[PDB]
Design an enzyme around this catalytic site. Structure first.
Site, PDB file in Angstrom:
ATOM      1  N   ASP A   1       0.803  -1.228   0.000  1.00 58.21           N
ATOM      2  CA  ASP A   1       0.000   0.000   0.000  1.00 58.21           C
ATOM      3  C   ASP A   1       0.826   1.263   0.000  1.00 58.21           C
ATOM      4  OD1 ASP A   1      -2.526  -1.136  -0.305  1.00 58.21           O
ATOM      5  OD2 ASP A   1      -2.608  -1.708   1.843  1.00 58.21           O
TER       6      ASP A   1
ATOM      7  N   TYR B   1     -10.190  -0.301   2.451  1.00 57.82           N
ATOM      8  CA  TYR B   1      -9.655  -0.330   3.804  1.00 57.82           C
ATOM      9  C   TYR B   1      -9.508   1.065   4.315  1.00 57.82           C
TER      10      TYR B   1
END
Ligand code: CU
Ligand code: CU
Lengths: 633, 633
Positions: free
Chosen positions: B301, B385
């Protein structure tokens, strides 16, 4: 007058009156402990059933227990205070010794600086007039068969000029041992201050390097802070009705108990059952200095003393921030009177950060809620130590058991230029021995009802190079059921997860049994060798999770009488019964291990070190239960 | 401009402008990422020294890096923005692929639902008027040698009614793949929704059981709550000067960065040095569903997207409770312009409970202080998320790294009456595969100075039945020194404690080198088999602690370019250099492993799950540094 209620003055005094009346002769009962027994569980489940559904409430007799001495003989009686009769009043076998009690400790502490052998020892120190002697009386612990209740008196120096001077900063090298009940001298022990076990006769004491914690004495310049205030302008969001708490979907009772501090009962969330009774059950504090008398320092703080008996009063300093409600504890004194211990339990809301958040990246519209929490706290002072025990509930159905250890390290003498590999030097002439705090948390679960099974799940790789997993990334869970009492081994590297499930109630979305899971880190267990009394007296401290079958009055993980015990009479017996616990009433006993390698920053007073175990719903609800919480906004 | 300052609009645009000027011809540069490099550490340490002591400041150029494409060719350039010139401008080798950028994702997302070939699959669903198709484009991952930048488009259904409908609650069973820069359709993947890997052609869609999170849609009755408010009537106790924070004895720089969200520099407490640079360094989220295309779900990420690029505006909000200061991030778009991301970082004080207490049982006089905490926070939204990253400082010298994961699960299609052992069913027609979030935190320590050694201490039994240890209770610490780059094995059963010490500075009380210790639980590491691309791409996620020798611009655990990487170009190379790191400049990379077995309660939006690592002074001070804190009173 609810069956879970804590003991009243009248019940405690009735209990002692009845023992006084039953005891003939001139050695009068010497009281040690009195508290109310839980109602029998099978009976109380029916009482709560009737209470929830408005049917007539069944009779449940209020029962108390008493520990008392007649001379050197120890007694345990069971008393029905609803009807005013003694049911059992039994002298205990040789070697069964009761808890310490404040009045007896005070007596011995007085004696430890007053007795002529000890005054004469003190004289050999050749103290100047600005230095005074202080004694901490300790329970004897166990390294032999010993049927007498003995007190090991740890001796220290303080500044004569101030009553809050830090005696722990200057330990002496002698320690007298008294027989507690007769007040007779037993022997004078000598403590090694050097790198090995060598002791010597009492020498003149040369230097007084105190390390003071008190603001009047510590000479530290205070670095100012701007205020930070918490307010609830419309009052708190919890209700207390008797001992029954209601907050954000939760209902449970909070009861002060002299041994555990408090216990929490009949825990429900969103109207569903979660846990029948929750408490701190025992805590053993074994030291790792191999030398005498230090090797005997293994308190069982709940069993030898009691977290309620030793609870602080939280209301006059402000330990609890916000709008607070309080409960009291009561204890007996050696005379059989009820001694009020005010405001030992505080109850309050606090803010726990965010509870959830999500933003759709396409629109930037968030949903968000704050994690409001409801805290039940008590703080025990056990001689030097402070233990803060919190149980914290939140709007997602989680119960968080949160302990902070603070107070002052228990300290040993240290001569000039010495280091030792089982202790940290924390002052110029004071060493803090390595120790562990091994806590047992007793969780009697009632997950969505009263037939539960304990299980544990591991997370494991899938076989590589198959049609199903050709890229070698897959992984899966596997479950093991606990069928009989025993312990579960730790396994952090399979992410082992202990759960309690209800095999009879299936989650209609995941298609598995509803559950609560335990969240706790892998931890080192008892460091004492298996061939030690520390091991024999505290089996719970050797494994992380234990399972028994429920029994009335089986509450304390190392057994009812820990003080100078020879062997574990709790889980070390109970977890070995050969019986079924699957889909039954398993009781879970979770061991929180904390190995404490002290650091200098822990002295003269120690910053909090926090430890936590969480109980969290796992497929208990059919979606996030916190969708009912207002948006943060 | 201070050398640590975050990039300005002028510097970011000067960077893109120089590249536009240097690029000749009609294929224009297509910008991917721009940010300011750290000043070289040697020079910066001299600079900080000069700034401290009023000497002339060394000359240090502001410098930026830029990732961009010219057609299909990927370039990295370094630019001097103080003087405005290109230093290097380098075509990257075949197979090196840059991070994703929001403008390119929006483009492929639009196309996922408009390209004729996908419109044809959609038409096969026979959708009714009240349902609409949604796409989350994903990075491709790696399962093969693949040089093209590819986007895997995950396809879902949502209510047509409402832009905040939870499309994650109804995944489809086809997934188009597009070449990102050309927008060419590459292929149509089909997803298994059954218990195994079998797939079919696209069938009509039978039912629409959405599980909605948004309050408009979720049907939930809201349970009210009374207000709880935090005030600081005299303002906060911290000061912000530029990017330099001062609070309760601490001093450090908080700098927003596009890749890490923020980094914290030059951390000193009570005037002494603690850590030179602290940052979340990477996070890989490998999925454990063995089946295609899922097996390729392994985001990096930070490397693939960036926590600052993806940061929420927190002032909106108000995610941070109390009196707050904020900072912004900036990122480039594909045109080379500076895009402002307002308020991605919030800075504030909060109450963290009690910091210490002790009551002398003799007098009942307490000393007590509250634990005031200073918080630095950012929250990134990465597709489904949310990651809440906090660094919390306290008055006893502890730095707590605290992460909360929330948002929405990444979800997979689920046929009626199916279960799978690598995923939890979280709605009637939606399953959440098992996955791990493996975070690496980079801690470039400067404990009391710039020559440090990494060490780990173990707590072990003394030999039983000796004269020193006759009661079998003793235990000691032993120390191992990290001499060379590599990793440390976990040993929770010996209470293994990682420390960074300064071998040149001895605590005058304990007689041992001053130290900071790492607190963190033992955790399961990477579950992908050793023989997988997950393994070759992320060596950091296989062991809990790594040590390298410091180098300028060596910041990211898995390497600079993670997107569709063939191998680790971070720690997998650097922790294998044969060089010495004792009493030098060791850099610590702590892996926080979180294995996520989703529960039904995590859906439709998940309650926070918290994870922490703490850095705690160990023998750094000569006594408790919190004696300067005012009594709570
Ligand atoms: Cu301790
Ligand atoms: Cu997750």
């Amino acid at each position: 007058v609810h069956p879970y209620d804590p003991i009243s003055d009248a019940e405690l005094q009735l209990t002692s009156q009845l023992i006084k009346d039953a005891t003939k002769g001139p050695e009068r009962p010497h009281f040690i402990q009195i508290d109310r027994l839980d109602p029998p569980k099978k009976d109380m489940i029916r009482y709560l059933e009737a209470e929830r559904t408005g049917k007539p409430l069944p009779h449940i007799s209020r029962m108390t227990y008493v520990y008392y001495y007649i001379g050197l003989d120890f007694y345990k009686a069971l008393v029905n205070v609803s009807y005013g009769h003694i049911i059992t009043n039994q002298k205990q076998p040789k070697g069964v010794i009761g808890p310490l009690i404040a009045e007896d400790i005070q007596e011995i502490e007085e004696l430890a600086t007053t007795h002529p052998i000890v005054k004469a020892e003190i004289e050999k120190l050749k103290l100047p007039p600005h230095v005074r002697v202080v004694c901490d009386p300790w329970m004897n612990g166990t390294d032999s068969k010993e049927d007498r209740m003995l007190i090991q008196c740890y001796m220290y120096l303080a500044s004569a000029a101030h009553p809050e001077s830090n005696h722990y900063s200057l330990p002496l090298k002698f320690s007298p041992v008294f027989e507690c009940l007769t007040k007779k001298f037993v022997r004078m022990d000598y403590l090694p201050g050097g790198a090995d076990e060598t002791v010597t006769e009492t020498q003149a004491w040369d230097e007084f390097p105190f390390v003071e914690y008190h603001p009047d004495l510590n000479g530290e310049t205070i670095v100012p802070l701007k205020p930070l205030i918490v307010q609830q302008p419309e009052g708190p969001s919890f209700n207390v009705d008797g001992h029954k708490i209601s907050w954000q979907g939760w209902e449970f009772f909070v009861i002060p108990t002299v041994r555990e501090g408090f216990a929490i009962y009949d825990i429900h969330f969103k109207g569903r059952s979660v846990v029948y009774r929750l408490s701190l059950s025992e805590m053993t504090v074994p030291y790792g200095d191999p030398r005498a008398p230090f090797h005997r320092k293994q308190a069982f703080d709940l069993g030898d003393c009691g977290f309620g008996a030793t609870g602080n009063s939280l209301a006059l300093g402000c330990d609890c921030l916000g709008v607070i409600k309080y409960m009291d504890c009561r204890r007996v004194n050696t005379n059989g009177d009820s001694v009020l211990i005010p405001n030992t339990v505080c109850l309050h809301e606090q803010d726990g950060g965010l509870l959830y958040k999500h933003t759709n990246y396409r629109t930037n519209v968030p949903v968000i809620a704050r994690r409001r929490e409801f805290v039940v706290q008590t703080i025990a002072t056990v001689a030097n130590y402070e233990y803060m025990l919190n149980i914290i509930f939140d709007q997602a159905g989680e119960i968080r058991i949160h302990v902070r250890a603070t107070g002052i390290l228990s300290t040993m003498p240290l001569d000039k230029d010495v280091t030792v590999p089982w202790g940290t030097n924390v002052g110029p002439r004071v060493m803090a021995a390595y120790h562990q705090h091994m806590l047992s948390f007793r969780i009697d679960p009632a997950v969505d009802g009263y037939e539960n099974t304990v299980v544990f799940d591991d997370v494991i790789r899938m076989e590589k190079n198959t049609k199903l997993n050709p890229y070698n990334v897959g992984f899966v869970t596997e479950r093991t059921v606990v069928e009989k009492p025993g312990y579960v081994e730790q396994s952090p590297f399979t992410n082992r997860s202990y759960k309690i499930i209800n095999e009879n109630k299936i989650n209609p979305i995941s298609k598995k049994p509803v559950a609560y899971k335990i969240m706790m880190p892998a931890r080192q267990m008892l460091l004492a060798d298996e061939d030690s009394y520390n091991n024999k007296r505290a089996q719970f401290a050797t494994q992380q999770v234990w399972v028994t079958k429920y029994r009335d009055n089986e509450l304390y993980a190392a057994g009812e009488f820990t003080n100078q015990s020879q062997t574990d009479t709790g889980l070390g017996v109970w977890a070995r019964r050969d019986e079924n616990v699957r889909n039954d009433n398993p009781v879970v006993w979770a061991t929180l291990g904390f190995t404490h390698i002290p650091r200098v920053e822990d002295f003269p007073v120690m910053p909090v070190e926090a430890h936590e175990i969480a109980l969290v719903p796992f497929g208990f609800f059919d979606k996030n239960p916190a969708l009912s919480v207002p948006q943060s906004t």
